[PDB]
Ligand binder design. Structure first.
Ligand SMILES: Nc1nc2c(ncn2[C@@H]2O[C@H](COP(=O)(O)OP(=O)(O)O)[C@@H](O)[C@H]2O)c(=O)[nH]1
Ligand SMILES: [Mg+2]
Length: 146
């Protein structure tokens, strides 16, 4: 299967950092990955014309930075905007988990946001490559489920 995934979020949260790691780069990315014994190719659009960007993907990844409370609030704005434009899979991502001292958003607040959105939540660190692979395999699983 071939899927389009759009990365949404406030500037500076790590969208491009996460896309490049997935794409294997040091825009858009493609890459086939095997999830649960089945291969799937994901086309990741790191392009966040808001209306135009929101009317495409087969899934959306809303990213905020755990060190930026404002970016977390922006995640809620994006979810509302998305509801006004599109039952497509949404994954909420709290990035920069490695910056422990500068955290501004707790893991609990992230999990609570996910309960409100009724979506999957994961925390990542583009700096350490932690949970990056898990994020995209998760997008594939959520798409198949829907
Ligand atoms: N320490 C740390 N820095 C990160 C992480 N992800 C992104 N950054 C940094 O945050 C800034 C914004 O990164 P960028 O990928 O351009 O975010 P974008 O604007 O959402 O695309 C850069 O200074 C990155 O080096 C992370 O997981 N840990
Ligand atoms: Mg970027």
């Amino acid at each position: 299967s071939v899927y389009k995934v759009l990365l949404l979020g406030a500037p500076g949260v790590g969208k491009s950092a996460l896309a490049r790691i997935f794409g294997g780069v040091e825009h858009t990315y493609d890459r086939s990955i095997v999830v649960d014994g089945e291969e799937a190719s994901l086309m990741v659009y790191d392009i966040w014309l808001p209306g135009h960007c929101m009317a495409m993907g087969d899934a959306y990844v809303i990213v905020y930075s755990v060190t930026d409370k404002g970016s977390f609030e922006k995640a809620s704005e994006l979810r509302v905007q998305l509801r006004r434009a599109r039952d497509v899979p949404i994954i909420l991502v709290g990035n920069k988990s490695d910056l422990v001292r500068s955290r501004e958003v707790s893991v609990d607040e992230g999990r609570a946001c996910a309960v409100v959105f009724d979506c999957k939540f994961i925390e990542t660190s583009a700096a350490l490559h932690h949970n990056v692979q898990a994020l995209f395999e998760g997008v594939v699983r959520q798409i198949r489920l829907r």
